[PDB]
Amino acid sequence: VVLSLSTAVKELVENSLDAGATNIDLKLKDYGVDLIEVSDNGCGVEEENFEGLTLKGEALSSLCALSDVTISTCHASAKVGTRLMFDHNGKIIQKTPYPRPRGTTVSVQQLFSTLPVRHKEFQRNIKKEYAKMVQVLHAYCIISAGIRVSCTNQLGQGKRQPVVCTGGSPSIKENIGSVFGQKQLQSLIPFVQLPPSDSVCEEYGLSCSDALHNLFYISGFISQCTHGVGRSSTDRQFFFINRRPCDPAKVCRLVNEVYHMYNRHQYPFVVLNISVDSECVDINQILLQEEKLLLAVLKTSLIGMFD
Ligand SMILES: Nc1ncnc2c1ncn2[C@@H]1O[C@H](COP(=O)(O)OP(=O)(O)OP(O)(O)=S)[C@@H](O)[C@H]1O
Ligand SMILES: [Mg+2]
Numbered sequence: 001v002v003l004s005l006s007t008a009v010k011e012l013v014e015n016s017l018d019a020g021a022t023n024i025d026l027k028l029k030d031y032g033v034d035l036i037e038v039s040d041n042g043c044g045v046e047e048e049n050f051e052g053l054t055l056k057g058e059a060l061s062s063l064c065a066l067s068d069v070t071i072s073t074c075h076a077s078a079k080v081g082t083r084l085m086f087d088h089n090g091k092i093i094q095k096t097p098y099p100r101p102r103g104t105t106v107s108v109q110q111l112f113s114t115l116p117v118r119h120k121e122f123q124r125n126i127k128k129e130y131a132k133m134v135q136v137l138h139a140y141c142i143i144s145a146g147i148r149v150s151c152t153n154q155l156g157q158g159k160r161q162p163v164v165c166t167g168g169s170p171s172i173k174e175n176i177g178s179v180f181g182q183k184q185l186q187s188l189i190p191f192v193q194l195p196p197s198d199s200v201c202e203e204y205g206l207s208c209s210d211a212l213h214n215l216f217y218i219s220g221f222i223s224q225c226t227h228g229v230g231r232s233s234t235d236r237q238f239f240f241i242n243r244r245p246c247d248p249a250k251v252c253r254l255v256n257e258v259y260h261m262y263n264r265h266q267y268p269f270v271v272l273n274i275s276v277d278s279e280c281v282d283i284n285q286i287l288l289q290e291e292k293l294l295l296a297v298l299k300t301s302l303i304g305m306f307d
Pocket of ligand 1 (some may be wrong): 018104
C-alpha cells in the first residue's frame, strides 16, 4: 500500500502513532516529489529488528521498492542511535552508529523513481495528489489530541512553507482551531447524541428491540444550521471510526443531507468520530453491523441540534 502520495504519508504517520510518538514532524520537498521525511519521538527501533524492518500489510518494504529509504533510529535501551540506508530490495546497504534522541526518522527520497510511468503521473497530478495528502494529514491532526503534528513543504531552494501544525492540545476542538484557525470554531456546535426518535426509527424499519443494542457513541463538531455559516463544498468533512480516518459513505450522505434540510445551499464543516466495538466493523467499503441504528441516531441527533 504505497499507491498514492497520501497513502504513503498515512502509512508513515500511522507508524509514528503506533510507536507512541507525541511529536511527529513531516518535512516535504517539492510537494513530496523529492522528499517525504517523517520525524518522531516514539519508541524507536531495537537492533535485533533492523533486518526485520523491511519484511513480515507491510508497506515499509514497499517504500524501499519505490524509493530510496533512509532511517535513523534509537530505542530507550540503546546506548547509541543508528542510521540505515536501504536498497530497493529492502536490504541494509549501510549501518552506522548515530547519536540521536529516542525515536525514528524515516526519509523517502524520489518516491516512485523506480516506476518511470507512475513517477511522471505522480508529477503531473501533483496538485491533486498533494491535496489528497493534505486532507489525510488534517484528519490525523484533528483526531490526535495530545500529539504535536507539524508539516512544512519546500519548493526548490525556496523558503519552507507552513502546511499545518497542532499544539499538542488535549481536545479535538483545540486541534480544529490549530489546523483551520480560530474563526472556523466559531461557526461550529458540538455533537449531542440523542436516543433514536420514534419517527426516525419508523422510517428506518427499527423497533423497540432494534434500539437497545445501540452501542454507538458519537462525538465531534458540525457547522451550525445558520444561513451563510456553512461551507461552499465538502472540503472540510472528516469522519472517523474508533479514531481512525475513514469514509463511511452512508453516514456522509445522511449528515450532508440532514444539514441541507436546514441550509439548502451549503455543506457543513464536519468532524465526527464513531466509537464502536471493533468486532462490528468489517472490511470488504465498510460494514457496520447496525448501520440503520447509527443512521437513526445520527439523524435524530442532528435534527435535535439544528432545531
Ligand atoms: N516510527 C516508527 N517507530 C518505531 N518503529 C517503526 C516506525 N515505523 C516503522 N517501525 C517498525 O517497522 C515495522 C513496521 O511496519 P509496517 O508498516 O511495515 O508495519 P505495521 O506496523 O505491522 O503496519 P500495517 O500493516 O501497515 S498496519 C513495525 O512493526 C515497527 O516495529
Ligand atoms: Mg505501518
